[PDB]
Structures are given as C-alpha cells and as structure tokens.
Amino acid sequence: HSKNVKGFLENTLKPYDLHSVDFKTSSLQSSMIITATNGGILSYATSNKNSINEINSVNNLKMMSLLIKDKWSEDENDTEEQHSNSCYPVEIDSFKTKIYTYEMEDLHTCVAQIPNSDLLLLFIAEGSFPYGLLVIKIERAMRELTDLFGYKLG
Amino acid sequence: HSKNVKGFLENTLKPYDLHSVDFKTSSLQSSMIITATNGGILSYATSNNDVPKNSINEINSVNNLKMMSLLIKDKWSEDENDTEEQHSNSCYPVEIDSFKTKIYTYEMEDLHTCVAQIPNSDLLLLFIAEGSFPYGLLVIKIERAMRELTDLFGYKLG
C-alpha cells in the first residue's frame, strides 16, 4: 500500500518479484503434445483412482485436444475473428511461434506450435490458474523442446 | 532437463516454481492513470534510468507519455466496441470481487504495454515496459495492481 495515487504508480515501477505473488493454483491439470494436423495426442501427462476413469480421462483429453486444435487452426488462418484470448508472437533461439489461450468451459488452456513443426504443446489448467502465468510457463517450457523444432509427421 | 517427452510433460504438471523464473526485465518504464474518455493523463510515474532528472528532459518525456497515452486510449476504445478488428495482442476478462474489467495488451513499436479500465470508472490504468518485459507478467501485475484501486472504482469525470 501507499499514501496516494502518485505513490502507488511509483511503486508499480519497482522490480516485480514474481516471488511475492500468491496464486490460488500454479499447477496444471494436463499437459500434452498433439499433432497440428489433426489434434491427435502423441504424448500426455495428467494429474487427473480406477480403470474406467483412466480410460475416460484419456478419452476426455482426446476430445479437448481436438477442440483446441480446431480453434488454433482457425485462428492461424486469420480470415475470421479470433477464438483466442491472446496471440503473443515469441522467439526461442530465433525460432518463431505464437502463444494462444483458450477458455474451455471453466478451464484455462494455453497452446503453442513447437516452432516449424507439425506439433503443438498444450497446457490445461483450472480457471484459477492465471493466463499470464500459463503464457510465461509455455514460453519457457518450449525452450526444452529444441529436438522437436521442425518435426514433420510426413 | 528430463529424459524424454513423457517426463518433460510430467514435469510441467508440478507447481510452477516462481523462484526459478528469471526475467531480463521486470521493471516498468512508466505507469499512469489516464481518462477513458480522452486518454488525458491524470497521474503518472516514470523511471529515471536514461537521462538526468532535469528540465528539458522532464518536459520532453511528459510530452511523449501524453502522445503514447493518447494512441493507446484510441486503440483501447476501438477494441472495446467491436469483435473482429482487434488492435490488442490479448483481451482477458477479469473479476475483482464482483467488479469486472478487461486487460488488453498492445505492442507499441518495441515497447510492451498493458491497459485495463478501472472498473465502472472513467479511468484506465496503463503500464509501459520495454519489449523484454513479458506480456504474461504485465497481465498478472496489472490484475493485482487493480485490486489496490477500489477507491477509484466507479470514478466519474466532471
């Protein structure tokens, strides 16, 4: 806190330690790599007890992945209005991609093409996980995936 | 690091350790409250890193801030009353308590900027930062900052 509006604005200029920032949730629900061509899951992890729920959970991820890939591909051919909440152009080692965000019912999702590839990296989180954090997260995580830059399904 | 793609994905599920996330830039260049009607600056602060705090410099930088505030307000206004023709890089509807607003981000030459209407008011909160200040961080920051400005919710000019 501060005395007045001027002092508040001066305080906003100080270095913003993401340290002092509390989040309701900062963990993902699910994370996967899917094809940019058809939204098929090539690899996934989830946080979310029995056999049918393991099966069901993969089925639900497949449906979600398909929906998200459709919105991503529509947004990429920018001849219509954007489904996405955000489109941030980014560079990892001079490889370019774009970070999109999609609301899916109560969930926050974030997706980016692995640069030059036929693959998307997709994060799925509860609605309490801020989009700003997802965007930071996905850009950093993408740096780990240089092996897959340019990956072609062929 | 990790062993394979599966392990990489599993690692992304863990609580995002903020204590490890380094940024090139996490300080704003400038911060202001401007009118949603005309983009007129009502209060501002700017960092003193470039030139000495003197006279000509002060006059010049305020003039620049006024020009930028106007351009950004115009972009915001246009975005607020349409669907498909968005200038902004993002638009996040947020709720503070039961009040609603929207966080917009704009590329301004090499600068990253972030703006949100102070809920139910004639005022906008505007952040200006260098291009190395990630938009995701600006969005987090302005939502949190907006929580401190309840005194100004419902503020009307006149």
Curated annotation (Swiss-Prot), chain A:
A single MF term (Gene Ontology): identical protein binding
Residues that span the membrane, as ranges: 119-136
Phenotype of gene-disrupted mutants: Abnormal activation of TORC1 signaling. Abnormal punctate localization of TOR1. Sensitive to high hydrostatic pressure (mechanical stress).
GO biological process, one term: protein transport
One Pfam assignment: SLM4
Entry-linked Gene3D superfamilies: Dynein light chain 2a, cytoplasmic
Domain of life: Eukaryota
Membrane topology type: Single-pass membrane protein
InterPro entries, per database record: Slm4 (IPR020233)
UniProt keyword annotations, A-Z: Autophagy, Membrane, Protein transport, Transmembrane, Transmembrane helix, Transport, Vacuole
Protein's cellular compartments: Vacuole membrane
Keyword check for Transmembrane: yes
A Gene Ontology cellular-component term: cytoplasm
Function, in words: Component of the GSE complex, a GTPase complex required for intracellular sorting of GAP1 out of the endosome. Component of the EGO complex, a complex involved in the regulation of microautophagy.
Additional free-text comment from the UniProt record: Present with 3490 molecules/cell in log phase SD medium.
Subunit structure: Component of the GSE complex composed of GTR1, GTR2, SLM4, MEH1 and LTV1. Component of the EGO complex, at least composed of GTR2, SLM4 and MEH1.
The name this protein goes by in its record: Protein SLM4
Source organism phylogeny: Eukaryota, Fungi, Dikarya, Ascomycota, Saccharomycotina
